[PDB]
Write an enzyme that holds these catalytic residues in place. Sequence first.
Site, PDB file in Angstrom:
ATOM      1  N   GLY A   1      10.005   3.439  19.394  1.00 58.03           N
ATOM      2  CA  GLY A   1       9.052   2.404  19.747  1.00 58.03           C
ATOM      3  C   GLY A   1       7.620   2.722  19.365  1.00 58.03           C
ATOM      4  O   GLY A   1       7.235   3.887  19.246  1.00 58.03           O
TER       5      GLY A   1
ATOM      6  N   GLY B   1       3.422   1.168  19.967  1.00 59.11           N
ATOM      7  CA  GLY B   1       2.551   0.255  20.677  1.00 59.11           C
ATOM      8  C   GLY B   1       1.159   0.329  20.093  1.00 59.11           C
ATOM      9  O   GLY B   1       0.926   1.036  19.114  1.00 59.11           O
TER      10      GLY B   1
ATOM     11  N   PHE C   1      14.669  10.900  29.435  1.00 66.29           N
ATOM     12  CA  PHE C   1      15.162   9.912  28.479  1.00 66.29           C
ATOM     13  C   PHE C   1      16.230   8.993  29.058  1.00 66.29           C
ATOM     14  O   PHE C   1      17.140   9.459  29.737  1.00 66.29           O
ATOM     15  CB  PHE C   1      15.737  10.648  27.249  1.00 66.29           C
ATOM     16  CG  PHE C   1      16.300   9.742  26.179  1.00 66.29           C
ATOM     17  CD1 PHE C   1      17.670   9.507  26.090  1.00 66.29           C
ATOM     18  CD2 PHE C   1      15.454   9.137  25.241  1.00 66.29           C
ATOM     19  CE1 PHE C   1      18.200   8.687  25.079  1.00 66.29           C
ATOM     20  CE2 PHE C   1      15.965   8.317  24.228  1.00 66.29           C
ATOM     21  CZ  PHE C   1      17.355   8.094  24.150  1.00 66.29           C
TER      22      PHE C   1
ATOM     23  N   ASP D   1       1.760  -3.915  32.924  1.00 65.31           N
ATOM     24  CA  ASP D   1       2.322  -4.433  31.682  1.00 65.31           C
ATOM     25  C   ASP D   1       3.835  -4.404  31.650  1.00 65.31           C
ATOM     26  O   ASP D   1       4.443  -3.960  30.675  1.00 65.31           O
ATOM     27  CB  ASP D   1       1.763  -3.658  30.488  1.00 65.31           C
ATOM     28  CG  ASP D   1       1.963  -4.404  29.157  1.00 65.31           C
ATOM     29  OD1 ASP D   1       2.082  -5.658  29.154  1.00 65.31           O
ATOM     30  OD2 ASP D   1       2.000  -3.738  28.103  1.00 65.31           O
TER      31      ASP D   1
HETATM   32  N1  LIG Z   1      11.817   7.432  28.951  1.00 64.16           N
HETATM   33  C1  LIG Z   1      12.086   6.603  27.923  1.00 64.16           C
HETATM   34  N2  LIG Z   1      13.311   6.542  27.363  1.00 64.16           N
HETATM   35  C2  LIG Z   1      13.345   5.652  26.370  1.00 64.16           C
HETATM   36  N3  LIG Z   1      14.526   5.468  25.691  1.00 64.16           N
HETATM   37  C3  LIG Z   1      14.955   4.369  24.978  1.00 64.16           C
HETATM   38  C4  LIG Z   1      14.171   3.124  24.817  1.00 64.16           C
HETATM   39  C5  LIG Z   1      14.673   2.030  24.081  1.00 64.16           C
HETATM   40  C6  LIG Z   1      15.976   2.131  23.472  1.00 64.16           C
HETATM   41  S1  LIG Z   1      16.578   0.899  22.649  1.00 64.16           S
HETATM   42  N4  LIG Z   1      15.426   0.115  21.942  1.00 64.16           N
HETATM   43  O1  LIG Z   1      17.285  -0.067  23.709  1.00 64.16           O
HETATM   44  O2  LIG Z   1      17.630   1.456  21.565  1.00 64.16           O
HETATM   45  C7  LIG Z   1      16.761   3.350  23.615  1.00 64.16           C
HETATM   46  C8  LIG Z   1      16.266   4.448  24.350  1.00 64.16           C
HETATM   47  S2  LIG Z   1      11.839   4.847  26.092  1.00 64.16           S
HETATM   48  C9  LIG Z   1      11.172   5.748  27.366  1.00 64.16           C
HETATM   49  C10 LIG Z   1       9.752   5.593  27.804  1.00 64.16           C
HETATM   50  O3  LIG Z   1       9.299   6.359  28.810  1.00 64.16           O
HETATM   51  C11 LIG Z   1       8.854   4.598  27.169  1.00 64.16           C
HETATM   52  C12 LIG Z   1       7.541   4.988  26.676  1.00 64.16           C
HETATM   53  C13 LIG Z   1       6.683   4.014  26.071  1.00 64.16           C
HETATM   54  C14 LIG Z   1       7.105   2.627  25.940  1.00 64.16           C
HETATM   55  C15 LIG Z   1       8.431   2.213  26.436  1.00 64.16           C
HETATM   56  C16 LIG Z   1       9.285   3.194  27.043  1.00 64.16           C
END
Ligand SMILES: Nc1nc(Nc2ccc(S(N)(=O)=O)cc2)sc1C(=O)c1ccccc1
Length: 277
Positions: free
Chosen positions: A11, A13, A74, A119
């Site tokens: 991701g 931002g 995670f 947010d």
């Molecule tokens: N802890 C954590 N784990 C994450 N795993 C994750 C997220 C999306 C997908 S997906 N797109 O469904 O394949 C797969 C694994 S994201 C995260 C954050 O803490 C975070 C940080 C900044 C913004 C948004 C989330």
Amino acid sequence: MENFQKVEKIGEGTYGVVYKARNKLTGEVVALKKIRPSTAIREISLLKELNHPNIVKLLDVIHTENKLYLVFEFLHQDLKKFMDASALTGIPLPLIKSYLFQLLQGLAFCHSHRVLHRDLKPQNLLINTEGAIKLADFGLAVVTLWYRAPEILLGCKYYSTAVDIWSLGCIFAEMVTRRALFPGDSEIDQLFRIFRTLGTPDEVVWPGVTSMPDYKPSFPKWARQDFSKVVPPLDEDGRSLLSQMLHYDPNKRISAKAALAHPFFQDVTKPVPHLRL
Ligand SMILES: Nc1nc(Nc2ccc(S(N)(=O)=O)cc2)sc1C(=O)c1ccccc1
């Protein structure tokens, strides 16, 4: 970082990039957000103590080389992906209810600790195979405006915990209908989509609204739409709760604590979601 091996970018931002990474030493898998002050860094050190089952654990904060790294536990999928994956059939109501209930518990907790998220959106709501959902990417005191509370759009300078309830109500509606409730593509379009559905607010339903920074007497006057048309597949308990999460007046908007006691959750359970990872 040097202590972390990036597995993949998960991701981006307008302030940070998030990677799935592995601790080269402990071998633990984490989410690592990379950002390129004092009150802020101290505001973050505070988030570290915020421990609740529905809040993503912040493991470590590293400030080095003009970069700020936040290490989080995670989770394997976000709600945006799960909703897209569930678009053909829809997320079963019991799981929608469980997720809403859990997110309200998380907000009730942060709000009681005077912490606001600011947010909330499907992309920062993370789920696991056990049926849990957790709040991620807390905001500090193309951007999606779809979940933004009207008081923010109208220029309020001091957000209240009510902004998070509004965002969660929008997300709840979206899980139910499988369509974003207010998909604005600009601040004014966002505001006007809200007005077209809930009615243009006035001093009756929202005392003080006409004196807000960005309020214009020239705003169009739209009548409120029948709520049964807004989220048709939702039963009356759900519609009742949603209407309380979407009150215009931040002071009339239901709190997370009060929402948890709503009749809608009388039969809440914790189902297992079908997750394809
Ligand atoms: N802890 C954590 N784990 C994450 N795993 C994750 C997220 C999306 C997908 S997906 N797109 O469904 O394949 C797969 C694994 S994201 C995260 C954050 O803490 C975070 C940080 C900044 C913004 C948004 C989330």
